[PDB]
PDB file of all heavy atoms in Angstrom:
ATOM      1  N   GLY A  36      30.250 138.410 145.698  1.00  0.00           N
ATOM      2  CA  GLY A  36      28.939 137.874 145.323  1.00  0.00           C
ATOM      3  C   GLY A  36      29.105 136.541 144.572  1.00  0.00           C
ATOM      4  O   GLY A  36      30.196 135.983 144.532  1.00  0.00           O
ATOM      5  N   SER A  37      28.004 136.015 144.053  1.00  0.00           N
ATOM      6  CA  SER A  37      28.008 134.713 143.313  1.00  0.00           C
ATOM      7  C   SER A  37      27.340 134.899 141.989  1.00  0.00           C
ATOM      8  O   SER A  37      26.574 135.844 141.792  1.00  0.00           O
ATOM      9  CB  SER A  37      27.238 133.646 144.106  1.00  0.00           C
ATOM     10  OG  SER A  37      27.974 133.258 145.266  1.00  0.00           O
ATOM     11  N   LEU A  38      27.605 133.995 141.057  1.00  0.00           N
ATOM     12  CA  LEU A  38      26.847 133.878 139.801  1.00  0.00           C
ATOM     13  C   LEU A  38      26.769 132.374 139.540  1.00  0.00           C
ATOM     14  O   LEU A  38      27.554 131.579 140.157  1.00  0.00           O
ATOM     15  CB  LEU A  38      27.620 134.522 138.649  1.00  0.00           C
ATOM     16  CG  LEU A  38      27.628 136.063 138.564  1.00  0.00           C
ATOM     17  CD1 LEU A  38      28.598 136.551 137.478  1.00  0.00           C
ATOM     18  CD2 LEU A  38      26.201 136.541 138.279  1.00  0.00           C
ATOM     19  N   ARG A  39      25.844 131.968 138.670  1.00  0.00           N
ATOM     20  CA  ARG A  39      25.815 130.592 138.214  1.00  0.00           C
ATOM     21  C   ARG A  39      25.743 130.579 136.727  1.00  0.00           C
ATOM     22  O   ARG A  39      24.719 131.015 136.125  1.00  0.00           O
ATOM     23  CB  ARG A  39      24.628 129.867 138.806  1.00  0.00           C
ATOM     24  CG  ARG A  39      24.570 128.334 138.458  1.00  0.00           C
ATOM     25  CD  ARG A  39      23.324 127.766 139.160  1.00  0.00           C
ATOM     26  NE  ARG A  39      23.131 126.370 138.778  1.00  0.00           N
ATOM     27  CZ  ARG A  39      23.728 125.335 139.373  1.00  0.00           C
ATOM     28  NH1 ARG A  39      24.594 125.545 140.366  1.00  0.00           N
ATOM     29  NH2 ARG A  39      23.434 124.076 138.984  1.00  0.00           N
ATOM     30  N   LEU A  40      26.781 130.065 136.075  1.00  0.00           N
ATOM     31  CA  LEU A  40      26.702 129.940 134.622  1.00  0.00           C
ATOM     32  C   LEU A  40      26.084 128.599 134.204  1.00  0.00           C
ATOM     33  O   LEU A  40      26.257 127.570 134.906  1.00  0.00           O
ATOM     34  CB  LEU A  40      28.082 130.003 134.010  1.00  0.00           C
ATOM     35  CG  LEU A  40      28.929 131.209 134.413  1.00  0.00           C
ATOM     36  CD1 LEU A  40      30.268 131.261 133.582  1.00  0.00           C
ATOM     37  CD2 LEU A  40      28.072 132.547 134.284  1.00  0.00           C
ATOM     38  N   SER A  41      25.367 128.601 133.090  1.00  0.00           N
ATOM     39  CA  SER A  41      24.777 127.353 132.548  1.00  0.00           C
ATOM     40  C   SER A  41      25.164 127.215 131.093  1.00  0.00           C
ATOM     41  O   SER A  41      25.366 128.235 130.384  1.00  0.00           O
ATOM     42  CB  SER A  41      23.231 127.354 132.681  1.00  0.00           C
ATOM     43  OG  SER A  41      22.811 127.604 134.040  1.00  0.00           O
ATOM     44  N   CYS A  42      25.154 125.995 130.610  1.00  0.00           N
ATOM     45  CA  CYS A  42      25.446 125.769 129.199  1.00  0.00           C
ATOM     46  C   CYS A  42      24.681 124.549 128.788  1.00  0.00           C
ATOM     47  O   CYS A  42      24.714 123.524 129.481  1.00  0.00           O
ATOM     48  CB  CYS A  42      26.955 125.494 129.066  1.00  0.00           C
ATOM     49  SG  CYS A  42      27.406 124.951 127.361  1.00  0.00           S
ATOM     50  N   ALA A  43      23.940 124.647 127.690  1.00  0.00           N
ATOM     51  CA  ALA A  43      23.246 123.496 127.188  1.00  0.00           C
ATOM     52  C   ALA A  43      23.702 123.283 125.759  1.00  0.00           C
ATOM     53  O   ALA A  43      23.815 124.271 124.991  1.00  0.00           O
ATOM     54  CB  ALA A  43      21.687 123.717 127.253  1.00  0.00           C
ATOM     55  N   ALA A  44      24.042 122.026 125.414  1.00  0.00           N
ATOM     56  CA  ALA A  44      24.263 121.633 124.022  1.00  0.00           C
ATOM     57  C   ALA A  44      22.950 121.358 123.312  1.00  0.00           C
ATOM     58  O   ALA A  44      21.939 120.980 123.939  1.00  0.00           O
ATOM     59  CB  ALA A  44      25.141 120.423 123.910  1.00  0.00           C
ATOM     60  N   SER A  45      23.016 121.472 121.978  1.00  0.00           N
ATOM     61  CA  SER A  45      21.851 121.296 121.102  1.00  0.00           C
ATOM     62  C   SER A  45      21.425 119.813 120.932  1.00  0.00           C
ATOM     63  O   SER A  45      20.371 119.533 120.350  1.00  0.00           O
ATOM     64  CB  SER A  45      22.138 121.881 119.717  1.00  0.00           C
ATOM     65  OG  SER A  45      23.299 121.267 119.152  1.00  0.00           O
ATOM     66  N   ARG A  46      22.236 118.874 121.410  1.00  0.00           N
ATOM     67  CA  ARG A  46      21.792 117.466 121.393  1.00  0.00           C
ATOM     68  C   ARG A  46      22.487 116.608 122.499  1.00  0.00           C
ATOM     69  O   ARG A  46      23.488 116.989 123.037  1.00  0.00           O
ATOM     70  CB  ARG A  46      22.050 116.861 120.016  1.00  0.00           C
ATOM     71  CG  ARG A  46      23.543 116.626 119.710  1.00  0.00           C
ATOM     72  CD  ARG A  46      23.674 115.785 118.387  1.00  0.00           C
ATOM     73  NE  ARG A  46      25.057 115.656 117.933  1.00  0.00           N
ATOM     74  CZ  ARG A  46      25.864 114.612 118.216  1.00  0.00           C
ATOM     75  NH1 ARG A  46      25.427 113.582 118.973  1.00  0.00           N
ATOM     76  NH2 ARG A  46      27.102 114.583 117.720  1.00  0.00           N
ATOM     77  N   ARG A  47      21.928 115.431 122.783  1.00  0.00           N
ATOM     78  CA  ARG A  47      22.614 114.441 123.649  1.00  0.00           C
ATOM     79  C   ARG A  47      23.511 113.616 122.702  1.00  0.00           C
ATOM     80  O   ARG A  47      23.389 113.721 121.458  1.00  0.00           O
ATOM     81  CB  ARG A  47      21.558 113.516 124.338  1.00  0.00           C
ATOM     82  CG  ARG A  47      20.659 114.254 125.364  1.00  0.00           C
ATOM     83  CD  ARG A  47      19.678 113.320 126.097  1.00  0.00           C
ATOM     84  NE  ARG A  47      18.667 114.083 126.868  1.00  0.00           N
ATOM     85  CZ  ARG A  47      18.001 113.609 127.938  1.00  0.00           C
ATOM     86  NH1 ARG A  47      18.226 112.369 128.391  1.00  0.00           N
ATOM     87  NH2 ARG A  47      17.100 114.375 128.554  1.00  0.00           N
ATOM     88  N   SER A  48      24.414 112.836 123.273  1.00  0.00           N
ATOM     89  CA  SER A  48      25.316 112.004 122.493  1.00  0.00           C
ATOM     90  C   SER A  48      25.268 110.625 123.144  1.00  0.00           C
ATOM     91  O   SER A  48      24.841 110.492 124.394  1.00  0.00           O
ATOM     92  CB  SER A  48      26.741 112.542 122.581  1.00  0.00           C
ATOM     93  OG  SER A  48      27.055 112.968 123.876  1.00  0.00           O
ATOM     94  N   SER A  49      25.682 109.595 122.405  1.00  0.00           N
ATOM     95  CA  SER A  49      25.512 108.230 122.939  1.00  0.00           C
ATOM     96  C   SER A  49      26.290 108.024 124.228  1.00  0.00           C
ATOM     97  O   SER A  49      25.858 107.235 125.107  1.00  0.00           O
ATOM     98  CB  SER A  49      25.894 107.175 121.892  1.00  0.00           C
ATOM     99  OG  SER A  49      24.881 107.152 120.870  1.00  0.00           O
ATOM    100  N   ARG A  50      27.494 108.631 124.291  1.00  0.00           N
ATOM    101  CA  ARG A  50      28.229 108.852 125.590  1.00  0.00           C
ATOM    102  C   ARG A  50      28.231 110.330 125.830  1.00  0.00           C
ATOM    103  O   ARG A  50      28.669 111.104 124.957  1.00  0.00           O
ATOM    104  CB  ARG A  50      29.685 108.386 125.490  1.00  0.00           C
ATOM    105  CG  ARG A  50      29.873 106.897 125.231  1.00  0.00           C
ATOM    106  CD  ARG A  50      31.362 106.505 125.268  1.00  0.00           C
ATOM    107  NE  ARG A  50      32.012 106.937 126.552  1.00  0.00           N
ATOM    108  CZ  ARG A  50      32.089 106.192 127.656  1.00  0.00           C
ATOM    109  NH1 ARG A  50      31.574 104.939 127.685  1.00  0.00           N
ATOM    110  NH2 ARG A  50      32.659 106.706 128.764  1.00  0.00           N
ATOM    111  N   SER A  51      27.707 110.771 126.976  1.00  0.00           N
ATOM    112  CA  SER A  51      27.768 112.198 127.301  1.00  0.00           C
ATOM    113  C   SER A  51      29.164 112.706 127.174  1.00  0.00           C
ATOM    114  O   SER A  51      30.114 112.003 127.588  1.00  0.00           O
ATOM    115  CB  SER A  51      27.243 112.428 128.723  1.00  0.00           C
ATOM    116  OG  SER A  51      25.806 112.149 128.701  1.00  0.00           O
ATOM    117  N   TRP A  52      29.304 113.924 126.612  1.00  0.00           N
ATOM    118  CA  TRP A  52      30.672 114.583 126.461  1.00  0.00           C
ATOM    119  C   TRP A  52      31.237 115.061 127.833  1.00  0.00           C
ATOM    120  O   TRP A  52      30.514 115.472 128.711  1.00  0.00           O
ATOM    121  CB  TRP A  52      30.575 115.790 125.501  1.00  0.00           C
ATOM    122  CG  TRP A  52      30.136 115.421 124.141  1.00  0.00           C
ATOM    123  CD1 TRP A  52      30.428 114.268 123.432  1.00  0.00           C
ATOM    124  CD2 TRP A  52      29.213 116.148 123.364  1.00  0.00           C
ATOM    125  NE1 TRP A  52      29.821 114.329 122.179  1.00  0.00           N
ATOM    126  CE2 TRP A  52      29.017 115.436 122.149  1.00  0.00           C
ATOM    127  CE3 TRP A  52      28.566 117.378 123.543  1.00  0.00           C
ATOM    128  CZ2 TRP A  52      28.168 115.916 121.126  1.00  0.00           C
ATOM    129  CZ3 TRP A  52      27.665 117.831 122.529  1.00  0.00           C
ATOM    130  CH2 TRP A  52      27.524 117.119 121.336  1.00  0.00           C
ATOM    131  N   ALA A  53      32.548 115.011 127.985  1.00  0.00           N
ATOM    132  CA  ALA A  53      33.187 115.821 129.023  1.00  0.00           C
ATOM    133  C   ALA A  53      32.886 117.290 128.681  1.00  0.00           C
ATOM    134  O   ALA A  53      32.845 117.670 127.465  1.00  0.00           O
ATOM    135  CB  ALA A  53      34.708 115.583 129.003  1.00  0.00           C
ATOM    136  N   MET A  54      32.639 118.116 129.705  1.00  0.00           N
ATOM    137  CA  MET A  54      32.412 119.520 129.440  1.00  0.00           C
ATOM    138  C   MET A  54      33.321 120.360 130.277  1.00  0.00           C
ATOM    139  O   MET A  54      33.767 119.928 131.358  1.00  0.00           O
ATOM    140  CB  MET A  54      30.956 119.892 129.813  1.00  0.00           C
ATOM    141  CG  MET A  54      29.937 118.934 129.356  1.00  0.00           C
ATOM    142  SD  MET A  54      29.472 119.215 127.682  1.00  0.00           S
ATOM    143  CE  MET A  54      28.612 120.890 127.720  1.00  0.00           C
ATOM    144  N   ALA A  55      33.536 121.604 129.845  1.00  0.00           N
ATOM    145  CA  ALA A  55      34.529 122.433 130.499  1.00  0.00           C
ATOM    146  C   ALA A  55      34.137 123.896 130.424  1.00  0.00           C
ATOM    147  O   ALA A  55      33.316 124.310 129.584  1.00  0.00           O
ATOM    148  CB  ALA A  55      35.935 122.237 129.798  1.00  0.00           C
ATOM    149  N   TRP A  56      34.728 124.665 131.288  1.00  0.00           N
ATOM    150  CA  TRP A  56      34.643 126.125 131.192  1.00  0.00           C
ATOM    151  C   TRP A  56      36.043 126.641 131.039  1.00  0.00           C
ATOM    152  O   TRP A  56      36.959 126.167 131.696  1.00  0.00           O
ATOM    153  CB  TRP A  56      33.972 126.691 132.473  1.00  0.00           C
ATOM    154  CG  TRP A  56      32.507 126.363 132.560  1.00  0.00           C
ATOM    155  CD1 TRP A  56      31.931 125.311 133.279  1.00  0.00           C
ATOM    156  CD2 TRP A  56      31.439 127.073 131.956  1.00  0.00           C
ATOM    157  NE1 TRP A  56      30.574 125.333 133.139  1.00  0.00           N
ATOM    158  CE2 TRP A  56      30.224 126.408 132.340  1.00  0.00           C
ATOM    159  CE3 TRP A  56      31.360 128.244 131.112  1.00  0.00           C
ATOM    160  CZ2 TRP A  56      28.966 126.864 131.959  1.00  0.00           C
ATOM    161  CZ3 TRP A  56      30.057 128.697 130.727  1.00  0.00           C
ATOM    162  CH2 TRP A  56      28.905 128.017 131.159  1.00  0.00           C
ATOM    163  N   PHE A  57      36.187 127.655 130.184  1.00  0.00           N
ATOM    164  CA  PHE A  57      37.372 128.432 130.053  1.00  0.00           C
ATOM    165  C   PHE A  57      37.044 129.891 130.207  1.00  0.00           C
ATOM    166  O   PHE A  57      35.820 130.288 130.136  1.00  0.00           O
ATOM    167  CB  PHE A  57      37.919 128.249 128.631  1.00  0.00           C
ATOM    168  CG  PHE A  57      38.541 126.925 128.408  1.00  0.00           C
ATOM    169  CD1 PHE A  57      37.725 125.790 128.179  1.00  0.00           C
ATOM    170  CD2 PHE A  57      39.949 126.825 128.233  1.00  0.00           C
ATOM    171  CE1 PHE A  57      38.331 124.547 127.913  1.00  0.00           C
ATOM    172  CE2 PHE A  57      40.584 125.558 127.965  1.00  0.00           C
ATOM    173  CZ  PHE A  57      39.772 124.443 127.771  1.00  0.00           C
ATOM    174  N   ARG A  58      38.086 130.748 130.331  1.00  0.00           N
ATOM    175  CA  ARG A  58      37.788 132.184 130.415  1.00  0.00           C
ATOM    176  C   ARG A  58      38.867 132.982 129.700  1.00  0.00           C
ATOM    177  O   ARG A  58      39.979 132.609 129.721  1.00  0.00           O
ATOM    178  CB  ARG A  58      37.627 132.632 131.872  1.00  0.00           C
ATOM    179  CG  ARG A  58      38.878 132.614 132.679  1.00  0.00           C
ATOM    180  CD  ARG A  58      38.541 132.923 134.123  1.00  0.00           C
ATOM    181  NE  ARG A  58      39.727 132.924 134.956  1.00  0.00           N
ATOM    182  CZ  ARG A  58      39.672 133.069 136.291  1.00  0.00           C
ATOM    183  NH1 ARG A  58      38.466 133.266 136.909  1.00  0.00           N
ATOM    184  NH2 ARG A  58      40.776 133.120 136.996  1.00  0.00           N
ATOM    185  N   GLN A  59      38.490 134.125 129.122  1.00  0.00           N
ATOM    186  CA  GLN A  59      39.428 134.930 128.377  1.00  0.00           C
ATOM    187  C   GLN A  59      39.276 136.357 128.817  1.00  0.00           C
ATOM    188  O   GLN A  59      38.169 136.861 128.889  1.00  0.00           O
ATOM    189  CB  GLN A  59      39.105 134.827 126.904  1.00  0.00           C
ATOM    190  CG  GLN A  59      40.212 135.500 125.990  1.00  0.00           C
ATOM    191  CD  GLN A  59      39.929 135.238 124.525  1.00  0.00           C
ATOM    192  OE1 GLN A  59      39.509 134.156 124.182  1.00  0.00           O
ATOM    193  NE2 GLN A  59      40.010 136.307 123.678  1.00  0.00           N
ATOM    194  N   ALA A  60      40.375 137.006 129.070  1.00  0.00           N
ATOM    195  CA  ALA A  60      40.368 138.479 129.393  1.00  0.00           C
ATOM    196  C   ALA A  60      41.417 139.156 128.509  1.00  0.00           C
ATOM    197  O   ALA A  60      42.328 138.488 128.028  1.00  0.00           O
ATOM    198  CB  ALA A  60      40.678 138.704 130.883  1.00  0.00           C
ATOM    199  N   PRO A  61      41.356 140.517 128.367  1.00  0.00           N
ATOM    200  CA  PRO A  61      42.308 141.156 127.382  1.00  0.00           C
ATOM    201  C   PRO A  61      43.674 140.973 127.854  1.00  0.00           C
ATOM    202  O   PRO A  61      43.947 141.002 129.145  1.00  0.00           O
ATOM    203  CB  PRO A  61      41.929 142.647 127.423  1.00  0.00           C
ATOM    204  CG  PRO A  61      40.375 142.611 127.807  1.00  0.00           C
ATOM    205  CD  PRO A  61      40.300 141.425 128.829  1.00  0.00           C
ATOM    206  N   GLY A  62      44.583 140.718 126.911  1.00  0.00           N
ATOM    207  CA  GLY A  62      45.999 140.645 127.235  1.00  0.00           C
ATOM    208  C   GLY A  62      46.468 139.299 127.798  1.00  0.00           C
ATOM    209  O   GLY A  62      47.652 139.145 128.117  1.00  0.00           O
ATOM    210  N   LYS A  63      45.551 138.316 127.887  1.00  0.00           N
ATOM    211  CA  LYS A  63      45.867 137.001 128.441  1.00  0.00           C
ATOM    212  C   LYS A  63      45.273 135.894 127.559  1.00  0.00           C
ATOM    213  O   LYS A  63      44.135 136.009 127.059  1.00  0.00           O
ATOM    214  CB  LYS A  63      45.291 136.859 129.856  1.00  0.00           C
ATOM    215  CG  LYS A  63      45.945 137.723 130.902  1.00  0.00           C
ATOM    216  CD  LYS A  63      45.377 137.393 132.319  1.00  0.00           C
ATOM    217  CE  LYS A  63      46.364 137.829 133.445  1.00  0.00           C
ATOM    218  NZ  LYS A  63      46.659 139.304 133.403  1.00  0.00           N
ATOM    219  N   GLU A  64      46.001 134.813 127.424  1.00  0.00           N
ATOM    220  CA  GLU A  64      45.556 133.680 126.671  1.00  0.00           C
ATOM    221  C   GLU A  64      44.312 133.099 127.339  1.00  0.00           C
ATOM    222  O   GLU A  64      44.278 133.073 128.501  1.00  0.00           O
ATOM    223  CB  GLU A  64      46.690 132.672 126.650  1.00  0.00           C
ATOM    224  CG  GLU A  64      48.082 133.337 126.598  1.00  0.00           C
ATOM    225  CD  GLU A  64      48.715 133.659 127.966  1.00  0.00           C
ATOM    226  OE1 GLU A  64      49.346 132.774 128.538  1.00  0.00           O
ATOM    227  OE2 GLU A  64      48.615 134.795 128.477  1.00  0.00           O
ATOM    228  N   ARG A  65      43.329 132.672 126.572  1.00  0.00           N
ATOM    229  CA  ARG A  65      42.154 131.961 127.149  1.00  0.00           C
ATOM    230  C   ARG A  65      42.627 130.838 128.064  1.00  0.00           C
ATOM    231  O   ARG A  65      43.494 129.989 127.645  1.00  0.00           O
ATOM    232  CB  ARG A  65      41.317 131.339 126.058  1.00  0.00           C
ATOM    233  CG  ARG A  65      40.033 130.801 126.566  1.00  0.00           C
ATOM    234  CD  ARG A  65      39.130 130.320 125.422  1.00  0.00           C
ATOM    235  NE  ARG A  65      38.857 131.385 124.450  1.00  0.00           N
ATOM    236  CZ  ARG A  65      38.133 131.193 123.342  1.00  0.00           C
ATOM    237  NH1 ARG A  65      37.642 129.978 123.073  1.00  0.00           N
ATOM    238  NH2 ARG A  65      37.891 132.197 122.505  1.00  0.00           N
ATOM    239  N   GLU A  66      42.059 130.797 129.262  1.00  0.00           N
ATOM    240  CA  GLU A  66      42.496 129.845 130.262  1.00  0.00           C
ATOM    241  C   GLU A  66      41.465 128.872 130.761  1.00  0.00           C
ATOM    242  O   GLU A  66      40.315 129.163 130.870  1.00  0.00           O
ATOM    243  CB  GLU A  66      43.171 130.502 131.443  1.00  0.00           C
ATOM    244  CG  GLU A  66      42.370 131.383 132.186  1.00  0.00           C
ATOM    245  CD  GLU A  66      42.946 131.761 133.561  1.00  0.00           C
ATOM    246  OE1 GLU A  66      44.152 131.694 133.769  1.00  0.00           O
ATOM    247  OE2 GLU A  66      42.194 132.184 134.408  1.00  0.00           O
ATOM    248  N   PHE A  67      41.952 127.696 131.033  1.00  0.00           N
ATOM    249  CA  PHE A  67      41.093 126.663 131.564  1.00  0.00           C
ATOM    250  C   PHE A  67      40.583 127.035 132.987  1.00  0.00           C
ATOM    251  O   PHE A  67      41.385 127.470 133.873  1.00  0.00           O
ATOM    252  CB  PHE A  67      41.935 125.355 131.675  1.00  0.00           C
ATOM    253  CG  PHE A  67      41.295 124.316 132.521  1.00  0.00           C
ATOM    254  CD1 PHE A  67      40.148 123.690 132.085  1.00  0.00           C
ATOM    255  CD2 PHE A  67      41.863 123.951 133.783  1.00  0.00           C
ATOM    256  CE1 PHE A  67      39.546 122.679 132.886  1.00  0.00           C
ATOM    257  CE2 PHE A  67      41.289 122.967 134.560  1.00  0.00           C
ATOM    258  CZ  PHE A  67      40.134 122.337 134.119  1.00  0.00           C
ATOM    259  N   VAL A  68      39.292 126.783 133.235  1.00  0.00           N
ATOM    260  CA  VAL A  68      38.708 127.083 134.502  1.00  0.00           C
ATOM    261  C   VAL A  68      38.269 125.801 135.229  1.00  0.00           C
ATOM    262  O   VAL A  68      38.612 125.607 136.423  1.00  0.00           O
ATOM    263  CB  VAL A  68      37.560 128.024 134.312  1.00  0.00           C
ATOM    264  CG1 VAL A  68      36.816 128.250 135.680  1.00  0.00           C
ATOM    265  CG2 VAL A  68      38.137 129.408 133.806  1.00  0.00           C
ATOM    266  N   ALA A  69      37.464 124.960 134.564  1.00  0.00           N
ATOM    267  CA  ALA A  69      37.043 123.672 135.225  1.00  0.00           C
ATOM    268  C   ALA A  69      36.542 122.693 134.169  1.00  0.00           C
ATOM    269  O   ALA A  69      36.150 123.096 133.031  1.00  0.00           O
ATOM    270  CB  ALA A  69      35.928 123.933 136.286  1.00  0.00           C
TER     271      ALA A  69
END
Side-chain angles (χ1 to χ4, degrees):
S37 289
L38 284 172
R39 184 179 175 85
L40 307 187
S41 306
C42 172
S45 57
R46 71 170 173 95
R47 293 183 191 204
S48 41
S49 288
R50 297 185 54 91
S51 291
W52 299 325
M54 315 277 294
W56 290 97
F57 287 79
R58 69 186 180 185
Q59 189 174 321
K63 291 186 158 59
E64 325 89 85
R65 189 174 303 178
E66 62 165 24
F67 165 69
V68 174

